[PDB]
């Protein structure tokens, strides 16, 4: 199986956060 | 099996016994002179809610109703992927639209569940139910065209496929089709994620289709209200040869009666290719193509 | 100044009156192989705490002393850029290694922290290790464990992010120093950057009980960095060459060991030349413990 991640942020295509957990308003 | 429904689960918690969340951010995500507002909230479920892309999970708001009994649950549709906005799997996210309108008699009705959300505060707890529903969960085909038709909240299973699609990266699902967004709201100060679908067009600009329906704002050539479905006819001969395809999926949600406006463009659409549209949407949802979730 | 510092803040946040954040997530991220852990925690700041890459921010750990007071602060780097992982600057992250020596009280206390609960924050503290300011400059940063916290800081700003006031064109070069591969902390976030900027930036791990030179002796990061004697040396002659250097105390003995010899070679003497750098605000050094 593929190794463990040693990266919090393995699950997205560019290793970080895709976007704001708090979105920007209009 | 034509959507992603690998093991499954529902109903892991119910009414009886909630699983007690707590809100970890709570933002409201819409201009202050939109006609209502909208919040985007993250809460912590420790991982025990199994949900996936397109279910929905309910809500106990605090307190008792007018005969002494817990608030019966509301069901929110699933704004986040099935790992979070956090990419944790530690998550749920929901898109609540609070509920203020007032009645001919001028009194104001205030929804219990909805205000009750949107109040929440870091923090807080919140009683959650579920997952809850298979109605609209994605195809399975990674090649598919996902036509996407929402209203206002009717964003969130939209937004939560859009994450698993263009954000996440997956042993077994790699998206190569094609989504096409049609969202529509009232005004520009209502349009929810747009900054998020923004980024979604810069990663994959041939794979992502996007479009608002403003309809207090926009108009076509002839001066008509850009509702959801008058987008759509800007696009009648792209929409309508891709709607023939066994390899499109369309997908519907939001406030109810966004369903008779559809149906009025799509009756056109089919009646110049010599086709009775109505005949035609019962094929299409018994083939798996035409998922709708509507409520008032 | 050749740092970041404009409008730089320290101490907005006192341990009398700390800044009460909340956990957002907490993962390890360690294998379950390593000897140890370490874990990476998010925390909501509401965007209170103006920090920038290269500081740290003080944890007032819960609980009492032994007379029943509160815990002394424990500081620790940032590890995130200042927009966050997120990138809406309002959340702070850290690396957090569990210490047992008698268990740690705050590294314990953090990397047993839940989403949701609240978190006493100080500061933001530190100018030592800002960033240079020159965009097209090198920057060499030598870490070993958890030392490896600013410099996650400072490549997100470099490679991960984008600013209309900072497009970073120069050369930035990690050495990681680690025990085990289980160990090698953001490994998969260095290796993204390495294929998104394969010209600026450069990578090299050191892992001790894995890997040996030619010699056959333990990979440290000296030992790694000695690799690249003449590579290094270079770098280290010109003035837009930035050094910095975070972890456990201790790893600057072995270092300083393996730049005698470089400096040697040119009839320089390492010790001073060193001071000479540490002056020019181009060997920046945080190690502890
Ligand atoms: C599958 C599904 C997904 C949903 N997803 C979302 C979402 O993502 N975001 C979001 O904001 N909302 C969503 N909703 C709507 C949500 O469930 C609540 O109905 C809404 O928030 C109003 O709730 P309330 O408790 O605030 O209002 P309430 O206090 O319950 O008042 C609602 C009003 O409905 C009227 N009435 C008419 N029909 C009914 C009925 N069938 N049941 C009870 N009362 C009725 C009454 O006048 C009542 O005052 C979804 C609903 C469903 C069924
Ligand atoms: C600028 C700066 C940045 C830092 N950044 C980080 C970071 O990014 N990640 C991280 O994990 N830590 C970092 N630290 C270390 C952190 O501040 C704490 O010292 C560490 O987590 C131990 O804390 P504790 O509260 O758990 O231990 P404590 O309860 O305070 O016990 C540790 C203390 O034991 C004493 N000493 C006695 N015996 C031993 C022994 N056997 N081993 C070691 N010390 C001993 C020392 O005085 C040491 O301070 C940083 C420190 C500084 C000054």
């Given at each position: 199986?593929?190794?463990?991640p040693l990266?919090?942020?393995?699950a997205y ?7 704001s957990?708090?979105?920007?308003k209009? | 099996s034509?959507k992603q ?6 109903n892991?918690?119910?009414?009886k016994?909630?699983?007690?969340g707590?809100?970890?951010?709570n933002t409201?995500?819409?201009?202050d002179?939109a006609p ?5 909230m993250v809460f912590?479920?420790?991982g ?7 279910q ?5 708001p605090?307190?008792?109703?007018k005969?002494g009994?817990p608030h019966?649950?509301?069901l929110?549709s ?5 790992i979070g906005?956090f990419?944790?799997?530690?998550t ?15 009194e104001v009705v205030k929804?219990?569940?909805?205000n009750?959300?949107?109040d929440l ?5 919140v009683?959650?139910?579920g997952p809850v529903?298979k109605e609209?969960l994605?195809?399975?085909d990674?090649n598919?065209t996902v036509?996407?038709?929402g ?6 299973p939209?937004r939560?496929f859009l994450w698993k699609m ?5 042993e077994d ?5 094609l989504?096409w ?5 009232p005004?520009?100060?209502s349009?929810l994620y747009?900054?998020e679908?923004?980024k979604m067009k810069?990663?994959?600009?041939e ?12 108009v076509?050539?002839?001066g008509?209200?850009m509702?959801?479905?008058?987008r759509?006819?800007?696009?009648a001969?792209?929409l309508?040869?891709?709607l023939?395809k066994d390899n499109?999926?369309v997908?519907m ?5 966004m ?9 056109s ?5 010599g ?9 299409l949802?018994?083939?798996e193509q ?6 008032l």
């Open positions: 199986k593929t190794e463990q990266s919090p942020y393995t295509d560019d290793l970080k956060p895709p976007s957990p708090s979105p920007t209009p | 034509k429904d690998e093991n499954i689960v529902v892991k918690f119910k009414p016994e909630p699983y007690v707590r809100c970890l951010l409201k995500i819409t201009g002179d209502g507002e909208t919040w985007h912590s479920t420790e025990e809610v199994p949900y996936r892309e397109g929905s999970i309910g809500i106990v605090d307190g008792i109703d005969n009994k019966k649950l509301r929110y699933i704004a986040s992927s099935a906005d990419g944790d799997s530690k749920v996210s929901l898109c609540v639209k609070r509920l203020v309108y007032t009645n001919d008699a001028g929804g219990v569940c909805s009750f959300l949107c505060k870091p923090g807080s707890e009683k959650i139910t529903g609209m994605m195809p399975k990674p598919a036509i996407m038709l209203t206002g909240t009717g964003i969130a939209f939560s263009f954000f996440e990266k997956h699902y790699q998206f190569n089709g989504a967004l049609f969202l529509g709201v005004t520009s100060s349009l747009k900054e679908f923004e810069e990663k994959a600009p794979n992502f289709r996007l479009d608002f329906a403003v309809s207090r704002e926009q076509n050539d002839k008509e209200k509702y959801i479905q008058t759509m006819a800007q696009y001969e792209e309508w040869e891709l023939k499109t999926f997908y949600c939001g406030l109810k009666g369903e008779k406006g559809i149906d009025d463009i799509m009756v659409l089919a009646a110049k290719d086709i009775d549209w109505i005949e035609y949407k019962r094929t949802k018994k083939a035409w998922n709708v979730e509507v409520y």
